[PDB]
Amino acid sequence: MYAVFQSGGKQHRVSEGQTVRLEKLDIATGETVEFAEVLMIANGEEVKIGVPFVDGGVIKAEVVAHGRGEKVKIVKFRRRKHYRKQQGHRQWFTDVKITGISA
Amino acid sequence: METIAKHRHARSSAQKVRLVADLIRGKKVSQALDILTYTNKKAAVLVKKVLESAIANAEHNDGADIDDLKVTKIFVDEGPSMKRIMPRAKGRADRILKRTSHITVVVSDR
Amino acid sequence: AVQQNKPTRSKRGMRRSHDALTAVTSLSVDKTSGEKHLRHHITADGYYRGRKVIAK
Amino acid sequence: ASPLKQQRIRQKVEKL
Amino acid sequence: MKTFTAKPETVKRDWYVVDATGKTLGRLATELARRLRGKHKAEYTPHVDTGDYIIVLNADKVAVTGNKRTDKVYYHHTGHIGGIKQATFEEMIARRPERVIEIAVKGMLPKGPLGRAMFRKLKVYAGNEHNHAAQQPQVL
């Protein structure tokens, strides 16, 4: 099977895949809580039942994974002009990973 | 070491002798002389005693013999710019550098 | 009769391109061990037939 | 004496 | 992981062939160039490399707009000063369908490398079959 669903950005493509994202909202952990994200898989994608749009019905979902909810990155990013160099700011958004239990 | 034999100053520029000792490098040791003893000018004699050194120096520090060897590294580095002053007309500036150069040449083997 | 910027290292050698001497291609003579200039004969003592200067 | 060990000899003793 | 679509270093090419003769003029250039980049092509993200061979034929037949045929001019300029500039008709230049009239196409595309030898991938000839001397090797 294959997949797709959003919640910030439409990153979902691969199978389970273990792949980046955003996070919860109070602080990732590692474990999980078993938060199955909600329907949108183009009926997966694979199998003679390679169904068209998403819902061949309701209740075709996945499950969490909490692949490891952290990460820095850093990007310099600091402007300039011709009579002042604001040169001073960096601001990532943290991030959580995931390995989503397949469709 | 695999026997060395430098100079130290000797007096005669970086580029001037970086020339000469480019012919030497790779083959050599036996070819040392031949291709210096003929190839003309001055720069190319202040190598033909640092080669006779870097050979007797492999018959002392190193027990190696006068037919082997290789000349696996040469380079001429920038010795102190020996400075003075020239007249000219009115005076302005005469930087005049009497420029110099250390030698180091190294022979070893396959 | 003067430049305006600085002829970078890059160009330092883009004249120098051509120089890097070339050396020889020498031969011996029937009578010296392996000397001989490219035109003058035995350095080893000095001659070609015989009494060139002082020989044998 | 091999023409470099000769270029030696012949001189190292045009010394002695 | 992270998307974009890879484009090996190309890894795919072709062998098409198209007549021209039919008075289609210039408008042909378009898909004669998009198909030289990748229109119909819905894969192989260009912008970096890509390609797709074509071979046009004759060309010495393409009605051209309306009056254009008599008037349209080209101007080469040799720059060897002597005060150059070389006006020339469509009429007069169709007395030699080489690089031009069919190379009103090299101007519909990128220019610079890529867009450089991205256009030699055209091939011209001035009389289809009979002296379509090009690689017979399989066309469409």
Next chain:
Amino acid sequence: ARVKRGVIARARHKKILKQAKGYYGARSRVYRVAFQAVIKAGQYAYRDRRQRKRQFRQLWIARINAAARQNGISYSKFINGLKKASVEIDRKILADIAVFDKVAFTALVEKAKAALA
């Protein structure tokens, strides 16, 4: 009492001086780079990065066009079908599927094509 400002010396300079993607010359040799090279990048990265989400945007929707207009009907009419379709409608980057799983895409084209009043 003293300062011998010479200790915060290169500590201030090496600081940026370490900007040697080559760059070139004193553009990573001296302090010509000063900022006049790093402060450069240091802005180029601001926009010409910020720019990418429209530089990969137009990207997809060239492919997206080539696809559906290679099945009949193009990125203009196409999206129209798609949008008129509530829960039934997602959006590019994945409308890149047309390059790893055609039929999938080719199927989307259907669903889009048919929705068309």
Next chain:
RNA sequence: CCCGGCGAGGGGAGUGAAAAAGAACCUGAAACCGUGUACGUACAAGCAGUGGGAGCACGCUUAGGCGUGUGACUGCGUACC
């Protein structure tokens, strides 16, 4: 002791914790100049960086498209004071 011109200078050997401490001598940065190696480079236009980004060189994960120098090619794009 050895090369050298009864030179410069240098190589061994001795000293000594150390000579990478050798007397032009403590630490030994920068501008600047060499030698080694890897990627790039002989149809290619500009403040030379940015976003892509292949490929090679390299270390990698009992794939999972990774770190590193590189950077063909292609979107912008005329240093500062």
Next chain:
RNA sequence: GUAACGGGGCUAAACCAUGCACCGAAGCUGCGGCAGCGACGCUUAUGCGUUGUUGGGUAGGGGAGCGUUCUGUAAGCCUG
């Protein structure tokens, strides 16, 4: 030196009218975070969850910081 569409080219790829579709900016939206500031909950110096909101900026105003040397700190502490 074409050189008075930017060009290639368009007899529509020009013009009038009409209409749907789409591309398009840092605008708006979504989403993860920063700070200043009024509210809700809670605790409760407080904060913190949320929440309304504001943060282009030269002359200049105001407010927090960073590190350099010396000083008690200290015959303390690192340190062959």
